[PDB]
Amino acid sequence: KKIESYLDKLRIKEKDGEERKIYAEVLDGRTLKTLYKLSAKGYITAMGGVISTGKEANVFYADGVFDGKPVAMAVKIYRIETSEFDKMDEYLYGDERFDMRRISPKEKVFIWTEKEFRNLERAKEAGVSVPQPYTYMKNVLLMEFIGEDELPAPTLVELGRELKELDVEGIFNDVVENVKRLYQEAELVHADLSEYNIMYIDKVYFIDMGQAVTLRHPMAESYLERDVRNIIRFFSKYGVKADFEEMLKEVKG
């Protein structure tokens, strides 16, 4: 009788029956190896529970270490099996950072992971409120946990009416300053900015930077105006009133 996998080499907190099963269901062998390697290099101390499960990617909690300090991490793992001309194949158009002449359909998830990492770096350097990026390897990206005591921060859509108890008007303005910094100093535009990928603890955080295109992308402008519409739409529901062309101007400067 041969062990099925090397999963028990990972350090997983509260690894009862069901916890193990979850990991054993979502990790493939190649991903397992990558997590093991990150643990041995010192980045991952122990892995915790599932934070998000999704089509393109799953996210888990981990305690780990960056730059000599203890940190709480979000461990984002892209599913390696990918299709069919992803939306994220298209999100590379016009991106000088990445040379198609070098890249093959098989490794395309590695590039998306890479691109998310570098977008977090870029956005952080521009003063955008995003998770601090730590490292990446293969289809695994390690970044700052936005939350407290292993509870992720609510998204704006989770908060809803509650936003009315936190200055919904300052929150909208916080969202708007972040899109402005992203556009003007990072030179990025989120492909689909919404109440689903914005978190809030005591300020806004933009938390899925993989869906962000450079300004040379053919649809940059369109995506920007759509983002502005999404944001006014959602906030208008809570009694913030704002003008499209005046926010678009604020962002575009």
Ligand SMILES: Nc1ncnc2c1ncn2[C@@H]1O[C@H](CO)[C@H](O)[C@H]1O
């Ligand atoms: N950096 C971070 N800190 C804490 N939680 C994070 C996170 N990044 C993502 N999440 C959770 O996973 C999904 C990311 O789009 C979901 O939107 C979100 O629930």
